[PDB]
Amino acid sequence: ARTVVLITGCSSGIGLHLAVRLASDPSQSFKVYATLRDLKTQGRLWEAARALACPPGSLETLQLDVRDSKSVAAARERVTEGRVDVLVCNAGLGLLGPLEALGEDAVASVLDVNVVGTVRMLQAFLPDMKRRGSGRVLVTGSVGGLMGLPFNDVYCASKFALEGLCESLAVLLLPFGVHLSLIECGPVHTAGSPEEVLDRTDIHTFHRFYQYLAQSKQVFREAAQNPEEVAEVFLTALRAPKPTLRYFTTERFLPLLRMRLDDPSGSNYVTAMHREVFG
């Protein structure tokens, strides 16, 4: 059909739910280009697709390695309909642990994909949307991209980066009638070694790691959302006459987010979050 969509990172989590959520819309108004990094993972996508009976030729597989400029280029050209009416920037990675234990090569990887990779999609897909004078860009945000979480230093870094990349472009894009919004997600219902962590860290840091790993499992269980609810914000947003900049899947997180805003110097939030995690 019509709305030509190109989603990134669809081999699990939200991206996958998303493609199928759209591919199979009752109105049959979306064509979908679910992009996988590693093609030999199209399995799940297709299974779930077959389960909802998405009409044939409404979902398509494309491989796309965001850490590489040519792939982004190639992917762009396979969009036969010749436009990408809605672009959903979703590839993202994560990283847990005491900074000192994280390997350089890992940190590099996390920003290349999360940050740089996002920009590369934007580069290739912005122009024609400026050209045509219309289109929609959707970026998967997170609560970690609005406030720092102990032991997630680099993921948060990488999640704030997109917050800044997307708020700047907002201002400029305004008059072009090209839209960009971020979907502020939280825990969604989606699934290092102590020898190695401990090896590379001071035991007191390690005691706190453990302590934190213990606190998030709790938080997950009670705050975590049904993937089908997270994906529904996406469509709520790609259907607003004039969408906002941020869409928040949950509101649970607004209170800590507010008291972070009242005291810019930070000692309030740093303190509340500190005990909120430890004691």
Ligand X SMILES: C[C@]12CC[C@@H]3c4ccc(O)cc4CC[C@H]3[C@@H]1CC[C@@H]2O
141 Cβ contact list (under 8 Å, min separation 6): 159, 162, 163, 182, 183, 184, 185, 246
Q: How many residues bind ligand X (CB under 6 A)?
A: 11
Give burial (CB, 10 Å; 0-12/13-18/19+) of 274.
exposed
Secondary structure class of 180 (helix, strand, coil) = strand
- Whether 212 has a binding-site annotation, put simply, is no
Does residue 33 bind its own copies (CB under 8 A)? no
Distance of closest approach, residue 148 Cβ to ligand X, in angstroms: 10
Residue type at 121? Answer: M
x/- binding map, residues 238-257, to its own copies, per CB under 8 A? Answer: ------xxxxx-----x--x
**Residue of 2, 50, 78, 274 interacting with its own copies (CB under 8 A):** 274
Q: Could you confirm whether 210 is annotated as catalytic? A: no
Distance of closest approach, residue 258 Cβ to ligand X, in angstroms: 14
Does residue 167 bind its own copies (CB under 8 A)? yes
Site for ligand X in 60-119 (CB under 6 A): none
Planar angle of CA 247, 249, 250, nearest 5 degrees: 120
137 Cβ contact list (under 8 Å, min separation 6): 86, 87, 88, 89, 122, 125, 126, 129, 178, 179, 180, 181
Structure tokens at 10: 């669809």
- Torsion angle of the four alpha carbons 174, 178, 179, 180, in this order, in degrees rounded to the nearest 10: -80
Contact region for its own copies (CB under 8 A) — 28-36, 86-94, 100-108, 222-230?
100-108
Q: Indicate the pairing of strand 30-36 with strand 3-8.
A: parallel
Distance of closest approach, residue 3 Cβ to its own copies, in angstroms: 23
Distance of closest approach, residue 143 Cβ to ligand X, in angstroms: 5
User: What is the length of the chain?
Assistant: 279
Site for its own copies in 59-88 (CB under 8 A): 69
x/- binding map, residues 143-182, to ligand X, per CB under 6 A? Answer: xx----x---------------------------------
Does residue 136 bind its own copies (CB under 8 A)? no
Residue ranges at the known binding site: 9-37, 65, 142, 159
**Mind telling me the catalytic residues?**
155
Residues at the contact surface with ligand X, assessed by CB under 6 A: 142-144, 149, 186-187, 215-216, 219, 276-277
